[PDB]
Amino acid sequence: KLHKEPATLIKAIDGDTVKLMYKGQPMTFRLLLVDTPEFNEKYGPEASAFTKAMVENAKKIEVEFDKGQRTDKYGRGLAYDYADGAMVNEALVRQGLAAVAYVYSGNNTHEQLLRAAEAQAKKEKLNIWS
Ligand SMILES: Cc1cn([C@H]2C[C@H](OP(=O)(O)O)[C@@H](COP(=O)(O)O)O2)c(=O)[nH]c1=O
Ligand SMILES: [Ca+2]
């Protein structure tokens, strides 16, 4: 299975990207399997605020790389982020602030968990699915 690794928050960027101090060096982390609207787009500020509150108020920050590629073409770390035990990726999808997207076979461990959260967000007509 995968493993959670500790890290510390430098600053929240937007809905699906956060700057973290990972093993002594700053790194921008892009959330796996999700896509939040840009800050300039509808639900973008809400998505940003959500992720921002989760990571800033969190005592325990953890990153969890999947079984494949760890960085993308933009130099961003690819992982699942946890704030006090709760997965940020999943929480965003459950609230309808992020759509399940960029699902690559190499990094798809929590795919079902997230698609289940998205289907429920859809049923409740939340935010992007309203
Ligand atoms: C989430 C994720 C995104 N990406 C790339 C796909 C997209 O590239 P292209 O834009 O070149 O298509 C980009 C989407 O990022 P953003 O949603 O931050 O724009 O990041 C990965 O390569 N792997 C991943 O796991
Ligand atoms: Ca995005």
Side-chain angles (χ1 to χ4, degrees), residues 2-130:
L2 316 178
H3 64 285
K4 295 172 183 178
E5 300 183 43
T8 52
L9 185 274
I10 294 182
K11 73 169 188 302
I13 304 175
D14 73 350
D16 56 27
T17 61
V18 300
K19 194 187 191 72
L20 300 177
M21 184 62 80
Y22 178 67
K23 306 192 82 63
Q25 304 302 327
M27 188 176 315
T28 291
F29 276 82
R30 173 64 167 79
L31 294 178
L32 281 171
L33 309 183
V34 305
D35 189 30
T36 54
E38 287 292 311
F39 182 86
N40 71 287
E41 298 159 0
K42 190 177 182 184
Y43 298 112
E46 282 76 16
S48 285
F50 185 92
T51 297
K52 180 188 176 68
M54 277 194 79
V55 299
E56 284 182 352
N57 291 261
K59 326 164 199 296
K60 175 179 62 177
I61 290 294
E62 296 165 308
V63 287
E64 180 186 63
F65 290 105
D66 206 318
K67 56 206 176 186
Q69 187 166 273
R70 291 188 167 195
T71 70
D72 64 18
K73 60 196 284 190
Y74 300 110
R76 306 178 297 187
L78 302 170
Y80 300 102
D81 291 7
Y82 294 81
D84 286 347
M87 197 201 305
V88 180
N89 313 56
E90 181 186 1
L92 284 161
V93 180
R94 183 57 184 91
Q95 292 299 131
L97 292 166
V100 178
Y102 296 107
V103 301
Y104 301 89
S105 291
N107 286 322
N108 69 167
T109 297
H110 298 315
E111 181 179 6
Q112 267 54 85
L113 178 62
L114 305 183
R115 290 194 180 289
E118 185 186 78
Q120 194 48 223
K122 279 184 167 68
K123 296 173 190 174
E124 296 177 353
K125 304 187 303 174
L126 297 176
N127 296 118
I128 70 179
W129 309 119
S130 64

